[PDB]
Structures are given as structure tokens and as C-alpha cells.
Ligand binder design. Structure first.
Ligand SMILES: c1cn2cnc3[nH]cnc3c2n1
Length: 215
């Protein structure tokens, strides 16, 4: 049992029929990074509300470079109010503002950030965990990184393989793909990237998990 076998089996379930191409809505945009941070320790449904708040308040509009600067310079207590629904809202506002200000400071623009960010840089941002860091890397920056989480741990454990450590679990999941790269890609069309494959693969596990299915 490896992650390629799991991908094929999950894929044949058609779990993403209703999803966008990268699973995460508004993938590859600033909003994906905001979601990746806001989703920590909460339900994604709640994250969607925070983003709705941000949009309804015209804090987030159509230009991501403007959006980045808006979040970096927004009054703490206003942002904190906005992201109430996803909980831990004072911590997350501070986290987002510091992150956004540090992106500007180190990378000048969100565009350049998407190109130059590393996991270690993200991990040096106070409050950003591996999962969030990785979700930013994959779902906001199109990097070849597969997010893992509690879902993936529990999903694998049920299939008979237990990997508690975040990095080893992720390596287990990435390596089965890497090892069968051409055959994994061939499941699609040779249309999509490996980053998108990971984006979708993690999506499948999440969806599989919410739907309460058996492999
Ligand atoms: C449905 C779509 N989703 C996108 N991104 C997420 N991050 C965590 N859960 C989700 C999710 N559920």
C-alpha cells in the first residue's frame, strides 16, 4: 500500500466532481493564503464567512497587491472583528497583519512572494503551522507540496499505516506520487501540474473524510 494506490482509488470515487480545478476555491490568489491561515484549528465553512466579511467590508477587492497592503496596514481590531467566525480571531488578525507586513518587507509584492517564498520563511512567521505554511505553498503559490493534516493521518491509519509526525506523513504521501509520477499524471490527461495533482489529492482526502466513506 502506497500513496499512488490511494490516489487511484480516491480518484475513482469522483470526489471532486463539484470542486474547482485546484479544489481550494480561489486558489492561486491572495484569498487562498488568507484561507490557509484562517482555517487553522477551525472549520472551512467558518473561514468562508470571514472572507465574506472581508469582501463585504471592501477590505478584500479584485487586486491582490492592493489586498496584501490592505491587510498589512489594516487596524488590528477591525481585522480581528472581521475574522471572528473562524475563531482565535485576535491571534489570527495579528498573524495575518504580521505575515502581510513581512511579505511586503521581504518580497515587495504578492506576485514576487509567490515565486520566492520558502516553507522556512513561512515557518518563521509567528503562528504559522506546517499545515498552514504548506497550504499557502500549494494552494496559494502553486508549489509542489502536499498538505497533510489530521484528516490524512486518520485516513492513513484506518488503511493500516500510522504516521504521527507531520513531515513523514507528508513524505509518505508525496513519495508514492513522485515514484509513479508518469502514471499518476496519466490519470488526468498530462493537462495538470504535480502541484495541482497534490492540490487535488489533498482535496480528495478531505472530501473523502467529510463524506464518511470507506476506500
Ligand atoms: C471544501 C473546500 N475546501 C477548501 N479548502 C479547505 N481547507 C480546509 N477544508 C477545506 C475545504 N473544504
Amino acid at each position: 500500500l502506497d500513496s499512488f494506490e490511494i490516489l487511484k482509488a480516491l480518484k475513482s470515487l469522483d470526489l471532486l466532481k463539484n470542486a474547482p480545478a485546484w479544489w481550494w476555491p480561489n486558489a492561486l490568489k491572495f484569498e487562498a493564503l488568507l484561507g490557509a491561515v484562517l482555517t487553522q484549528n477551525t472549520k472551512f465553512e467558518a473561514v468562508l464567512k470571514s472572507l465574506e466579511n472581508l469582501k463585504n467590508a471592501f477590505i478584500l477587492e479584485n487586486d491582490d497587491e492592493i489586498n496584501l497592503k490592505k491587510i498589512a496596514y489594516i487596524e488590528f481590531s477591525k481585522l480581528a472583528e472581521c475574522v471572528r467566525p473562524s475563531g482565535f480571531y485576535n491571534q489570527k488578525a495579528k498573524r495575518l497583519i504580521d505575515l502581510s507586513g513581512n511579505i511586503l518587507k521581504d518580497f515587495q509584492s504578492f506576485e514576487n512572494f509567490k515565486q520566492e517564498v520558502t516553507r522556512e520563511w513561512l515557518l518563521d512567521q509567528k503562528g504559522i503551522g506546517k499545515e498552514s505554511a504548506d497550504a499557502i505553498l500549494c494552494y496559494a503559490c502553486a508549489k509542489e507540496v502536499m498538505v497533510v493534516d489530521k484528516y490524512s493521518y486518520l485516513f492513513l491509519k484506518k488503511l493500516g499505516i500510522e504516521i504521527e509526525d507531520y513531515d513523514e506523513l507528508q513524505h509518505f504521501f508525496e513519495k508514492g506520487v513522485q515514484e509513479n509520477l508518469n502514471s499518476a499524471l496519466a490519470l488526468y490527461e498530462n493537462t495538470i501540474s504535480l502541484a495541482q495533482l497534490y492540490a487535488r489529492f489533498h482535496g480528495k482526502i478531505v472530501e473523502f473524510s467529510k463524506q464518511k466513506l470507506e476506500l
